[PDB]
C-alpha cells in the first residue's frame, strides 16, 4: 500500500569531475543520484606503469594543463552521453548499467569514453544502489557477486621496500611486501604491519639509509642487491618481535615486464647481468629457499607466456604466482591462461577492465579454476576505499593496498577495521591458508 | 502539523574507535548519531613535533602495541564518559556540546580524556548537526561562526621542499602559493604543475624524489638557500613567473634549532645566530626571493625576539605563530597585546574543540591578524579543514604538497565546494596575505 524510498532507485543525475590522485595527477570522480535521494561517489585510480592490454585510461594530451594528464575529455563523457544513457535506469541492476556503458562506448578497450569515465560511474552507481537497498557496499557486492552474506577479511600484502622503476634504483624487483598471516583479525594484522613498518625505519636509519617513501608509502633506500631488501625486512620483523615464517611471510611484484629487453631479463642491481626466462625463474627460486617468499607477481614479461608456463610447472606447486600485467583483470586473457597452466592467481584492478560487473566475472573465473584473487590498488590512488568492501563482499581472501603510510593506502586499512568491527567472525581472518600453495 | 526528522537532533549514540594516520600511528575516530537518524564521523590528526603548550594528545604508552602509541584510553573516554554525558543533548548547539566535554574533563589541557578524544567527538558532532540542518559542513560552520553565507576559497601554501627534522636544510618547510590563480581549482593545478617540474629538476641534479609526511621532496641540498633556488627553477620550467603567479612561504620551526639562547643552523657552516642575527638572515632571503610569509621564525618562548621580528618585518611580511600560539585564545590575546606576529596557524587539535578553534579565528580577524587553517604531519582521509577554511572565510590553508591523499583529499574537498558555490566563494589571491 505504501512504497519505501528504497524502491525509487532510478538514476536522476550523474556528475563527473576532475580530482587529484596521490601522485598529483588528475583522475575522474563520478556522482550517481537516484530518485529517492540516494547518492554514490567513486574515483578511478591510475597505474604508474600499465599493462599493454589494460582498458584505455583516456587523458587530454594538452601540455598547457597538468603536463598533458588532465581527464576533462573523460569527465565530459560522464556529464553528457553516459549521464544521458543512464537517467531513468535502475541502479540496482549493476550488470544492466555496466552493459549500457560498454555498448554505448562500443570499442573493445573503452577507447571512446575512457575506462576511467566508465569505472567511476560503475562504482558510484554501486554505492547508490547499496544505499537504496539499505545496506553497506560490501553487503551489496556479495549479492551482486551471487554469494549473499559470504564474507572474509582479506590477508594483506603490504609493499614496504619499493624498487625498480617507481622507486630510486639499486633495487630491480618493484615491490617487497610482508603478509601478517599470524594475525587472528585484520585489525591485529594492520597493527603488526604498522610495527614492522616503524621498526624498518629504525633499521634503515641505523645503516644511514633514506626513510622517505614512494607512491605506495614504502621506503626506497639505496641497497647493494635485490636480496638485501629481504635482509633488511627480516631485521625489522625480528626487531618488532615477530617470527619470519610463522607470524609474517613475504611476497614480491617483480614487474619483470619493466626490465625485459631482447628476450632477456636485465638487473641493474645484482651485477648488471642478463637472464633467460629459465635463468630468471632459477634466481627467484633461490630467493624462496633463503626467505619465506610465498607469492611472486609478474615474475616474467606480460607477453612471455612460454616463460610463465615454465615458471608455473617449476614453482607453482609450492608458491602463489600472481598475474597482473599478464591477465589485466580480463576474463578473455585469464581464460586462455587457465587453459595453458599459466599462474595460479590474479591481481584484481577494476580499472584494468573498467566495470564492476567485468571485475566480479574475473574473481569468479579465478575462484572456479582454483586460482586466488588478490584485490589491488594502483600506484595512483585516492581517499576512495572501494577495494576494502570489494575484498570483503567477494571473500577474495587477499588484498594489496600498500605500506602502512599515506592515507591513499591507510583509508583502505581504516575501512577494513570499520567493516570487521561490524561483522566480527561473520568475516573470519583465515590467515596463511588464503595463499595459493599453503 | 508534522515534525521533520531534522528537528530530532538529540544525541542517542556516540562510538569511538582506533584507526591509523598517514604515518601509520593510531588516532581517534568518533561517530555521533542523532535520534532523527543522522550520523557524523571524524578523526583527530597528530603533529610530528607539537608546541609545548598544546592540549594533551592522550597515548596509552603500552610498549607491546604500536610502540606505545595506542589510543585505547582516549577511545574508552569517547565510548564511556563522553557518550554518557552527551546522550540526549542537542548536536545543533556546538558550543553547549563542546562545553559539556571541556567541563567533564575538567583539566586545563584536556589531560583526562585527551584532546584527540574531545576533538573527534567535537567534529563528528558538527557534521551530524550539519546533516540534521540539511546543509553541507561549510554552510553549518559559517552559521556556528556568526557569519552566515560568508565564504571564500583559501589560498593554499604547499610544502614542496621538506627540511629540519634529513639533509643540510634547517628550515622545516618551503612552500609555494599560487596567488596568480582566479580559482582554487587553478591554484591546485598550478601547484601540481610546479611539484612535477620540481621532480624533473631534482632528477636532473641527481637528488632523491621520495617524499616526507606532507608529500614534499626531502633531498640533500647544500644550503637552506638552494631549497629556494630549485623551487624557482621548477616555477620557471612550469611556465609561471615567480613574484606575480607564485609567491613563497616558509615554516622555520625555529624552536627545533634553538639552544643556549642562539639559533644554530646545522648546514650553512653550523653557525650560531642571535634573535636579531636570525631575523636579519630571514630578511636577506626576502630580498633574494618573493618570500611573503614566515612561520615560527623564532623559538615559541622567545617573545622578546618575536616583538623585534614583528617591528622589523611585520609591515612587509606575514609572520605566523604556530608553536608560539597553539590555536589558544589566552596565548594569542597576550600576543596581540604585545605586537607579536600578525598571523596564526589554526590547528583544531592544538586546543581540541571546534568552538575554541572558532574563537581563535575571531580573536585574530578582529586584531587584523590572518588565520591559516593547517593540517598536522599525521593526517587521515578526513577533509574537515577544507570546510572549516571556507566556512570561516579564513582566506589561507596549509594542507600539504600536491602528493599523498592525506593532503590531496583536502584540495579535492576544496574543488567540490568551489564547484557548488562558484563566485559566492571567491579566490581573492595575494590580498589574503598579511603585508600586501
Ligand atoms: Mg604488479
Ligand atoms: Mg609550524
Residues 6+ apart with CB under 8 A from B436: B292, B430
Question: CA distances (Å), B77 to each of A37, A166, B82, B254, in order?
Answer: 36, 43, 6, 35
Grid cell in block for residue B279: 631575523
Residue B99 burial (CB count, 10 A): 14
Burial of A276-300, coded b for 16+ CB within 10 Å and e otherwise, reads ebeebbebbbebbeebbbbbbbbbb
Please spell the DSSP secondary structure of B124-157, one letter per residue: HHHHHHHHHTTS-HHHHHHHHTT-TT-----EE-
* Contact call for residues B361 and B326 (beta carbons, < 8 A): no
Q: How far apart are CA B389 and CA B383, in angstroms?
A: 11
* Contact call for residues A114 and A71 (beta carbons, < 8 A): yes
Lateral strand order in the sheet of A320-323: A155-156, A397-400, A372-376, A345-348, A320-323, A293-297, A249-253, A175-179, A158-162
User: Under DSSP, is residue B293 helix (H, G, I), strand (E, B) or coil?
Assistant: strand
* Contact call for residues A99 and A90 (beta carbons, < 8 A): no
Beta strands of B318-392 (E only): which ranges? 318-321, 343-346, 370-374
Q: How far apart are CA A268 and CA A224, in angstroms?
A: 10
Helix or strand holding residue B43 (H, E): strand B39-43
Q: How far apart are CA A306 and CA A391, in angstroms?
A: 31
Alpha-carbon distance A311 to nearest alpha carbon in chain B (angstroms): 33
Q: How far apart are CA A187 and CA B33, in angstroms?
A: 24
Sign of the dihedral defined by the CA atoms of residues A72, A73, A74, A75, in that order: positive
Ligand 1 mean position to A328 CA, how many Å?
A: 10
Q: How far apart are CA B372 and CA B294, in angstroms?
A: 12
Q: How far apart are CA A215 and CA A351, in angstroms?
A: 18
Q: Which of A379, A334, A336 has its CA nearest to residue A359?
A: A334
Grid cell in block for residue A183: 594475525
Residues 6+ apart with CB under 8 A from A287: A226, A227, A230, A252, A293
Q: Which of A393, A349, A356, A353 has its CA nearest to residue A375?
A: A349
* φ/ψ of residue B11, rounded to 5: -80, 120
Q: How far apart are CA A90 and CA B307, in angstroms?
A: 65
Q: Are strands B318-321 and B343-346 parallel, antiparallel or unpaired?
A: parallel
Ligand 2 mean position to B349 CA, how many Å?
A: 14
Interface A:B, Cβ pairs < 8 A: 130
Q: Which of residues 106-145 of A touch B (CB under 8 A)?
A: none
Domains present along chain A, CATH in parentheses: 10-134 (3.30.390.10), 135-438 (3.20.20.120)
* Cβ within 8 Å, pair B209-A168: yes
* Contact call for residues B59 and B76 (beta carbons, < 8 A): no
Residues 6+ apart with CB under 8 A from A58: A71, A73, A74, A77, A111, A113, A114, A115, A116, A117
Q: Which resolution in angstroms does this entry have?
A: 2.6
Burial of A162-188, coded b for 16+ CB within 10 Å and e otherwise, reads bbbebbbebbbbbbbbbbbbbbebbbe
Q: How far apart are CA B202 and CA B157, in angstroms?
A: 21
Q: How far apart are CA B370 and CA B7, in angstroms?
A: 36
Q: How far apart are CA A86 and CA B33, in angstroms?
A: 34
DSSP state, residue A248: B
Catalytic: A188?
no
Q: How far apart are CA B404 and CA A380, in angstroms?
A: 10
* Contact call for residues B304 and B278 (beta carbons, < 8 A): no
Q: Does A304 touch chain B (CB under 8 A)?
A: no
DSSP state, residue B108: S
Q: Does B263 touch chain A (CB under 8 A)?
A: no
* Contact call for residues A89 and A324 (beta carbons, < 8 A): no
User: Under DSSP, is residue A131 helix (H, G, I), strand (E, B) or coil?
Assistant: helix
Q: How far apart are CA A6 and CA A134, in angstroms?
A: 7
* Cβ within 8 Å, pair B379-A407: yes
Catalytic: A243?
no
Q: Which of A339, A335, A337 has its CA nearest to residue A322?
A: A337
Q: Are strands B39-43 and B26-34 parallel, antiparallel or unpaired?
A: antiparallel
Q: How far apart are CA B417 and CA B137, in angstroms?
A: 10
| Cα within 13 Å of Cα(A357), Cβ side | 16
Beta bridge mates, B10: B90
Q: How much of chain A is in helix, strand and coil states, percent to nearest 5?
A: 40, 20, 40
Location of C-alpha cell 602559493: B177
Q: How far apart are CA A192 and CA A183, in angstroms?
A: 8
Please spell the DSSP secondary structure of B26-39, one letter per residue: EEEEEEEEETTS-E
User: Under DSSP, is residue A99 helix (H, G, I), strand (E, B) or coil?
Assistant: helix
Q: How far apart are CA A300 and CA B165, in angstroms?
A: 41
Q: State CA B223 to chain mean position distance.
A: 27
Beta bridge mates, B158: B176
Question: CA distances (Å), B358 to each of B233, B353, B369, in order?
Answer: 39, 9, 14
Location of C-alpha cell 599478464: A326
* φ/ψ of residue A48, rounded to 5: -75, -45
Ligand 1 mean position to A72 CA, how many Å?
A: 28
Q: How far apart are CA A433 and CA B5, in angstroms?
A: 48
* φ/ψ of residue B77, rounded to 5: -55, -45
Q: How far apart are CA A172 and CA A170, in angstroms?
A: 7
* Contact call for residues A23 and A215 (beta carbons, < 8 A): yes
Q: How much of chain B is in helix, strand and coil states, percent to nearest 5?
A: 40, 20, 40
Three-state SS sequence of A21-54: CCCCCEEEEEEEEECCCCEEEEECCECCCCCCCC
Residue B240 burial (CB count, 10 A): 20
Q: How far apart are CA A122 and CA A357, in angstroms?
A: 8
Q: Does B17 touch chain A (CB under 8 A)?
A: yes
DSSP state, residue A220: -
Which chain B residue's Cα is nearest to A167? B210
Residue A49 burial (CB count, 10 A): 13
Residues 6+ apart with CB under 8 A from B32: B11, B13, B14, B39, B40, B41, B86, B91, B121, B124, B125, B127, B128
Grid cell in block for residue A28: 575522474
Q: How far apart are CA B128 and CA B13, in angstroms?
A: 12
Q: How was this structure determined?
A: X-ray
DSSP state, residue B79: I
Longest dimension (CA), chain A: 77
Helix or strand holding residue A170 (H, E): none
Residues of chain B neighbouring A404 (CB-CB closer than 8 A): 20, 24
Q: How far apart are CA B177 and CA B243, in angstroms?
A: 10
Please spell the DSSP secondary structure of A132-156, one letter per residue: HTTS-HHHHHHHHTT-TT-----EE
Alpha-carbon distance B133 to nearest alpha carbon in chain A (angstroms): 16
Residue B261 burial (CB count, 10 A): 11
* Contact call for residues A98 and A357 (beta carbons, < 8 A): yes
Q: How far apart are CA A304 and CA A325, in angstroms?
A: 11
* φ/ψ of residue A323, rounded to 5: -75, 125
Q: Where are the alpha helices (DSSP H) in A246-355?
A: 277-290, 305-315, 331-339, 350-353
Environment class of residue B241 by beta-carbon count within 10 Å: exposed (0-12), middle (13-18) or buried (19+)?
exposed
* φ/ψ of residue A68, rounded to 5: 95, 0
Burial of A401-438, coded b for 16+ CB within 10 Å and e otherwise, reads bbbbbbbbbbbbbbbbbbbbeebeeebbbbbeebbbee
Instruction: Given the residues B214, B300, B356, B418, select the one marked as catalytic.
Output: B214
Amino acid at each position: 500500500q505504501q512504497m519505501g524510498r528504497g524502491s525509487m532507485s532510478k538514476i536522476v543525475k550523474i556528475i563527473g569531475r576532475e580530482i587529484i590522485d596521490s601522485r598529483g595527477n588528475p583522475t575522474v570522480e563520478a556522482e550517481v543520484h537516484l530518485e529517492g535521494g540516494f547518492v554514490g561517489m567513486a574515483a578511478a585510480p591510475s597505474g604508474a606503469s600499465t599493462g599493454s592490454r589494460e582498458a584505455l585510461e583516456l587523458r587530454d594530451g594538452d601540455k598547457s594543463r597538468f603536463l598533458g594528464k588532465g581527464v576533462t575529455k573523460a569527465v565530459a563523457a560522464v556529464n553528457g552521453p553516459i549521464a544521458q544513457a543512464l537517467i531513468g535506469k535502475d541502479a540496482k541492476d549493476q550488470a544492466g548499467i555496466d552493459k549500457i556503458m560498454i555498448d554505448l562506448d562500443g570499442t573493445e578497450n573503452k577507447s571512446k569514453f575512457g575506462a576511467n569515465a566508465i569505472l567511476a560511474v560503475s562504482l558510484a552507481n554501486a554505492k547508490a544502489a547499496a544505499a537504496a537497498k539499505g545496506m553497506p557496499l560490501y553487503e551489496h557486492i556479495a549479492e551482486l557477486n551471487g554469494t549473499p552474506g559470504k564474507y572474509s577479511m582479506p590477508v594483506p600484502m603490504m609493499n614496504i621496500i619499493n624498487g625498480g622503476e617507481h622507486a630510486d634504483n639499486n633495487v630491480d624487483i618493484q615491490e617487497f611486501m610482508i603478509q601478517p598471516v599470524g594475525a587472528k583479525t585484520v585489525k591485529e594484522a594492520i597493527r603488526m604491519g604498522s610495527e614492522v613498518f616503524h621498526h624498518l625505519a629504525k633499521v634503515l636509519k641505523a645503516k644511514g639509509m633514506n626513510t622517505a617513501v614512494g607512491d605506495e608509502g614504502g621506503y626506497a633506500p639505496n641497497l647493494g642487491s635485490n636480496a638485501e631488501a629481504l635482509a633488511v625486512i627480516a631485521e625489522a620483523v625480528k626487531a618488532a618481535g615477530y617470527e619470519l615464517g610463522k607470524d609474517i611471510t613475504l611476497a614480491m611484484d617483480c614487474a619483470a615486464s619493466e626490465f625485459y629487453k631482447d628476450g632477456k631479463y636485465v638487473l641493474a642491481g645484482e651485477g648488471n647481468k642478463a637472464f633467460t626466462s629459465e635463468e630468471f625463474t632459477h634466481f627467484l627460486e633461490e630467493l624462496t629457499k633463503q626467505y619465506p617468499i610465498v607469492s611472486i607477481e609478474d615474475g616474467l614479461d606480460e607477453s612471455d607466456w612460454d616463460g610463465f608456463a615454465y615458471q608455473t610447472k617449476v614453482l607453482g606447486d609450492k608458491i602463489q604466482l600472481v598475474g597482473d600485467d599478464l591477465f589485466v583483470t580480463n576474463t578473455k586473457i585469464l581464460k586462455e591462461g587457465i587453459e595453458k597452466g599459466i599462474a595460479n592467481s590474479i591481481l584484481i584492478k577494476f580499472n584494468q577492465i573498467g566495470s564492476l560487473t567485468e571485475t566480479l566475472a574475473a574473481i569468479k573465473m579465478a575462484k572456479d579454476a582454483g586460482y586466488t584473487a588478490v584485490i589491488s590498488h594502483r600506484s595512483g590512488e585516492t581517499e576512495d576505499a572501494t577495494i576494502a568492501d570489494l575484498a570483503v563482499g567477494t571473500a577474495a581472501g587477499q588484498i594489496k593496498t600498500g605500506s602502512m603510510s599515506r592515507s591513499d593506502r591507510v583509508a583502505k586499512y581504516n575501512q577494513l577495521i570499520r567493516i570487521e568491527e561490524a561483522l566480527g567472525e561473520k568475516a573470519p581472518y583465515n590467515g596463511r591458508k588464503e595463499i595459493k600453495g599453503q
